[PDB]
From Swiss-Prot, chain B:
Reaction it catalyzes: K(+)(in) = K(+)(out)
Keyword Cytoplasm annotated: no
Residue ranges that the UniProt entry lists as topological domain Extracellular: 188-206, 261-266, 327-335
Lineage: Eukaryota, Metazoa, Chordata, Craniata, Vertebrata
Organism of provenance: Homo sapiens (Human)
Major site of localization recorded for this protein: membrane
Protein name: A-type voltage-gated potassium channel KCND3
Curated annotation (Swiss-Prot), chain E:
Protein name: A-type potassium channel modulatory protein KCNIP2
Binding site for Ca(2+) 3: 146, 148, 150, 157
Gene this protein is translated from: KCNIP2
Assembly and oligomerization: Component of heteromultimeric potassium channels. Identified in potassium channel complexes containing KCND1, KCND2, KCND3, KCNIP1, KCNIP2, KCNIP3, KCNIP4, DPP6 and DPP10. The KCND2-KCNIP2 channel complex contains four KCND2 and four KCNIP2 subunits. Interacts with KCND2. Probably part of a complex consisting of KCNIP1, KCNIP2 isoform 3 and KCND2. At least isoform 2 and isoform 3 can self-associate to form homodimers and homotetramers. Isoform 3 interacts with KCNIP1 in a calcium-dependent manner.
Biological role stated in the UniProt entry: Regulatory subunit of Kv4/D (Shal)-type voltage-gated rapidly inactivating A-type potassium channels. Modulates channel density, inactivation kinetics and rate of recovery from inactivation in a calcium-dependent and isoform-specific manner. Involved in KCND2 and KCND3 trafficking to the cell surface. May be required for the expression of I(To) currents in the heart.
Entry keyword Transport: yes
Keywords attached to this entry: Calcium, Cell membrane, Ion channel, Ion transport, Lipoprotein, Membrane, Metal-binding, Palmitate, Phosphoprotein, Potassium, Potassium channel, Potassium transport, Repeat, Transport, Voltage-gated channel
Residues engaged in binding Ca(2+) 2: 98, 100, 102, 104, 109
Entry GO CC: cytoplasm; dendrite; Kv4.2-KChIP2 channel complex; plasma membrane; synapse; voltage-gated potassium channel complex
Similarity comment: family membership: Belongs to the recoverin family.
Swiss-Prot/TrEMBL GO biological process terms: action potential; chemical synaptic transmission; clustering of voltage-gated potassium channels; detection of calcium ion; membrane repolarization; membrane repolarization during cardiac muscle cell action potential; muscle contraction; positive regulation of potassium ion export across plasma membrane
Amino acid sequence: GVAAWLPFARAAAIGWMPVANCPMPLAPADKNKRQDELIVLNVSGRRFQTWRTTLERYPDTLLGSTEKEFFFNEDTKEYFFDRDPEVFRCVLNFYRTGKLHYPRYECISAYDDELAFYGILPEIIGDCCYEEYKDRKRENAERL
Amino acid sequence: GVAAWLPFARAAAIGWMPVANCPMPLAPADKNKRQDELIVLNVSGRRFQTWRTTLERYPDTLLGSTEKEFFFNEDTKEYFFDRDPEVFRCVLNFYRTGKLHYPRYECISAYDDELAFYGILPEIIGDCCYEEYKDRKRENAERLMLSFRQTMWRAFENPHTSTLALVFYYVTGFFIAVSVITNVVETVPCGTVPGSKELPCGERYSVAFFCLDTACVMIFTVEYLLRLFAAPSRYRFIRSVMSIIDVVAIMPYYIGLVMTNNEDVSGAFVTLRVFRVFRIFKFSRHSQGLRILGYTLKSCASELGFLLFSLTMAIIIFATVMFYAEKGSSASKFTSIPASFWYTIVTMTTLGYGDMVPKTIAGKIFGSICSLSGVLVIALPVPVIVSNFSRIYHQNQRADKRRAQKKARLARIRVAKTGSSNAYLHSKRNSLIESQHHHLLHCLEKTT
Amino acid sequence: KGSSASKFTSIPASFWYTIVTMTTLGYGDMVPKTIAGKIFGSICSLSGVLVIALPVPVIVSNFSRIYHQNQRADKRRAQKKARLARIRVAKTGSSNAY
Amino acid sequence: FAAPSRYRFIRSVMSIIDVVAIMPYYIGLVMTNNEDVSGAFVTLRVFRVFRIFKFSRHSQGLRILGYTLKSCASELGFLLFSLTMAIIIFATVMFYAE
Amino acid sequence: GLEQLQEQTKFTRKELQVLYRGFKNECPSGIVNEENFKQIYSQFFPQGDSSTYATFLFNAFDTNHDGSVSFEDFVAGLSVILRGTVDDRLNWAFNLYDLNKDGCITKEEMLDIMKSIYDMMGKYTYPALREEAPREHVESFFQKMDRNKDGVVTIEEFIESCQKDENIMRSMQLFDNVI
């Protein structure tokens, strides 16, 4: 999540080097690094777009993993998901900020289906809108 | 904001030039000017588009400033914001019209976060939809909001800490009960005693009850002193209501035995015995409902004030009318306007004891109107009181439940941080980002 | 306590009056005759009204809620058979197409 | 003397209340016991209580009460009508049965 | 502005855009108060306590003595560390160590910073944990970097003494490779 202040932490590590009278400082961990690029998520014709460093913030889900390579087209350079394009927005905004919201106008069953597809768990819904999620899910359960 | 009528104002300035007999008119302020163009805001893949003169209407925000040049790409000619594309529409429509709206279906926290990002302040939300913004924000806020002395202060203010606290609580909630039952029973006239006068049990077995209430009041005063010794702010405690209750429940016995029948007139000890019932309020510590009742009686005191006022007004009105309509009768008990208060308060509450009933046509008509009037003037505060009670109860419920789940998410977060530290220790025993973080930690390992 | 033929002979014997006054019943076989008795009976009546008015909304709301819950439960159990009929009709149609 | 529209003021309700609260004393002392029969001064003393409505200027709740009594007069009309109807019905039945 | 920052700092324009997007993403326009700074560090140092050292260098980055750090405060400090000369990095380090900014470091001033860095290792260190051992580290430092012999190191005292070493000079070129 916090990866854009890592240069700042490395620069802050300057305070230790003069007091590092211990002989050896560790050799740097430099590897091949490539810039951020805009990747294009083509969800049901609707085109979302984001830095890939945004999606690599949660590597235990469909979009942060290599599972999404099952949905890539090398000829069009886009990921195509044949899913609902109105709930994918909440997933993308979870990847961006860090809190998962619940649109009050959405059917609870469609929301649960999309969360199950993308690998998100309903347990990490933000506290801002989590009582109403539980309300609607309770009502849906007792109705079905 | 108003910049498209500026040519019109310049053209209107023609009226001054002939009357500008003042010699010099100021030279024009002509500078390099370039046309409006459509600029393309690429918000999360969704392309918005607008004249840049639309965005330069508010130059104290992110889009009206030069700050947005941090988001420009010269190779694609577009501004890219990696933000939510559904709240950006409200920001753009604020730049266009001039009023900022609030989509009723949007989470208030996401809305506030986007407004904070773009430099807009929630204070300029249009009046059209601003009460509901405040409603949702209030609801969101309220939804998201020593080993000897302080340990016993933690035990007192939370009886469910240890089983020692549970036993102490269940034994202080027993002498209250036994004292209440004793004060009730001491008046029961029992025992025929065919040899002497018929007396109540309380004065027949005088010392038997002296033992009981002395034990009770000693326990009460010692537990009060313990509350005092554990009170961190020993002046905030004295000002509390339960402190007053305990003081006024214990003192009717001290004041009682200091001025015992060595100097006694019967018209002054019944007051000391009436006050002895106020120790039944000590159950406030044991039942949450009895505390919610006080909280709701205090939350809606503005309604009880009007209740008392309208009630006494209606009482005076109907007592006057009933007295003058019923004054002259055979054995009329409506002897006075104060004496007609009784009837009226017995009629407005739909009690109807029947010891005072009218006997004239006017008396009957006005009693019949008094009953309905009392019904309607007492029916006003009851919905408010019961609604406040249920509201506060369901508020406390959700408060405790949220305080429960907060610990769950704290557990989640420090579990995650433990997992990260274990991942570091694992990589030390031999993913393109954690490499540099682990290297930073390794550089720190200079410390030894 | 002190009156001509006072029927308030005891604090238990005064329970009757109070429960007859808090419920707005008012039989009238026990009525106060002193100014303090009248004042406190007049306060007792309103106090009883307000302390009995607390559980009634909860009880009636729960009753209506459970009734309208059973209604919808039976209606949904009705339509479930309809959709099961739909599905095995469709599968019969597929077998007939084969 | 401060009323801008001194005819809109007279037509107001508080003006009527003040007039009918003050006049039971004027009308009272003009026709004092120089000419008096006991059946006519109790009416002048009953009207003397209507000055308690002068508290309308002081308590906002007492004005909201009038505003809501005027806003829902269509319901009070039906209340009076249905009450009279039921009273007549049940009084007839009870009289003939008793 | 993007251009005044293009000229004030040794950074390029794309490197300024990346840093600004990250910075504002982590703290949008409520730029930073001294408490959120420490909460941002807290993500990089598990197994330890970093609040004291965070507070120590928050005032180093706060060029003016306002209550907050802006983006120019952030980026000028990053440039003077990641792109400046070795002398500039050493001046930044010394000004961090010297607390009252008088020009001289006494044993208390650097003792505080040594305790602060030691607190970051956390609860358990694999070898022993002492207090006179941080005192010994302060002693070894004052040994290596002082000719005054008055228990006080100064700006030139630290500059000329910190240059002659070898391993720390190979260390202070770590900040040039990855940026």
